[PDB]
Amino acid sequence: KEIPEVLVDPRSRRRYVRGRFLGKGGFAKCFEISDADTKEVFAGKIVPKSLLLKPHQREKMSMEISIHRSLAHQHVVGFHGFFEDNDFVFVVLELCRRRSLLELHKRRKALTEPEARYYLRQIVLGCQYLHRNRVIHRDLKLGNLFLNEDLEVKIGDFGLATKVEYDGERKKVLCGTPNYIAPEVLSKKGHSFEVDVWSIGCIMYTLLVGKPPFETSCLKETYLRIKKNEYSIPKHINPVAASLIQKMLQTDPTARPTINELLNDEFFTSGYIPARLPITCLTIPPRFSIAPS
Numbered sequence: 001k002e003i004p005e006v007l008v009d010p011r012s013r014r015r016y017v018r019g020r021f022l023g024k025g026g027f028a029k030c031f032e033i034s035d036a037d038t039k040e041v042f043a044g045k046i047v048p049k050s051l052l053l054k055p056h057q058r059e060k061m062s063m064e065i066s067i068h069r070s071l072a073h074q075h076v077v078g079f080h081g082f083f084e085d086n087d088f089v090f091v092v093l094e095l096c097r098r099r100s101l102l103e104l105h106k107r108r109k110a111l112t113e114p115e116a117r118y119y120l121r122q123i124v125l126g127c128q129y130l131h132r133n134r135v136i137h138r139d140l141k142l143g144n145l146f147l148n149e150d151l152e153v154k155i156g157d158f159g160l161a162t163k164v165e166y167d168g169e170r171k172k173v174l175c176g177t178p179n180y181i182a183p184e185v186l187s188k189k190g191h192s193f194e195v196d197v198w199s200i201g202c203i204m205y206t207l208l209v210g211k212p213p214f215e216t217s218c219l220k221e222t223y224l225r226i227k228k229n230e231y232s233i234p235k236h237i238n239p240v241a242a243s244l245i246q247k248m249l250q251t252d253p254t255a256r257p258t259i260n261e262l263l264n265d266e267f268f269t270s271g272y273i274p275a276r277l278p279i280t281c282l283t284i285p286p287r288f289s290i291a292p293s
């Protein structure tokens with residue numbers, strides 16, 4: 001059961017030429033695809049229905065599309081549309097030519113402070129948007145934080161995302177295994193927006209330190225350390241940065257800042273935030289010099 005060379009949406013009469021294989025995001029296989037008329041290039045996420053035999057699995061895909069289609073923001077992956085034939089589900093998404101923060105992290109390890117500040121701000125701005133629209137992502141991690149040609153961050157993969165339907169709703173189910181998973185989820189006693197602030201906590205730690213805060217050889221031992229709040233921040237991290245991390249990584253979800261407080265932290269308001277980064281920043285640390293020489 002093999003994937004067509006040209007992807008035809010019958011409703012909109014659009015045709016997409018399947019270009020280069022980008023990789024396998026879970027069930028899906030992703031390709032560079034291009035609209036035959038405009039030649040505009042997108043990421044095509046193609047999932048075979050042979051892996052969607054169970055209603056539960058179908059319901060999750062429908063939910064992901066439902067959530068993601070409703071979203072439009074500078075720091076959220078553009079959802080351009082979706083369609084399906086008897087064999088496949090096709091989702092047409094904003095292409096992010098510079099991959100994700102995971103691949104950045106693997107090249108550069110710990111970032112410089114102004115880089116972190118730069119990316120974190122964009123991460124926060126997109127998450128503010130999600131939260132304003134009553135959406136919790138629930139799996140914010142480096143691999144889901146994509147980068148376009150100008151190194152702007154775009155939040156993707158809404159496969160674990162959920163809608164808060166009513167005020168003070170505490171979700172008690174999360175079908176999935178988030179990476180930077182919050183202690184309320186692991187204890188399994190209900191959760192909401194603060195799950196994403198925890199994840200942003202871990203992301204900020206990873207970006208500045210060069211490894212994740214609760215890492216071990218065993219996933220269960222890692223979950224153990226999250227329960228006990230067992231991490232520590234290196235001495236060389238500046239106290240303003242360290243303090244913000246500490247605020248975000250509290251076991252009590254009610255103690256963490258909300259998403260809208262974050263940009264007002266000293267960390268942002270009293271440090272250098274570059275307006276943009278050069279492409280060299282994928283490979284070489286920037287000195288942020290005051291004039292060419």
Ligand SMILES: COc1cc(C(=O)NC2CCN(C)CC2)c(F)cc1Nc1ncc2c(n1)N(C1CCCC1)CC(F)(F)C(=O)N2C
Nearest residue numbers: 021022023024025030043045077094095096097099146156
């Ligand atoms: C041209 O841009 C991209 C290049 C690569 C890329 O460099 N792929 C290499 C990986 C190694 N193999 C051997 C050769 C191909 C890549 F992995 C991803 C690229 N772009 C990209 N844009 C958007 C998405 C995206 N990748 N992801 C990634 C995540 C895992 C696979 C692609 C797919 C997605 F899910 F559709 C999705 O939602 N989004 C937002």
Ligand SMILES: [Zn+2]
Nearest residue numbers: 056174175176
């Ligand atoms: Zn399930």
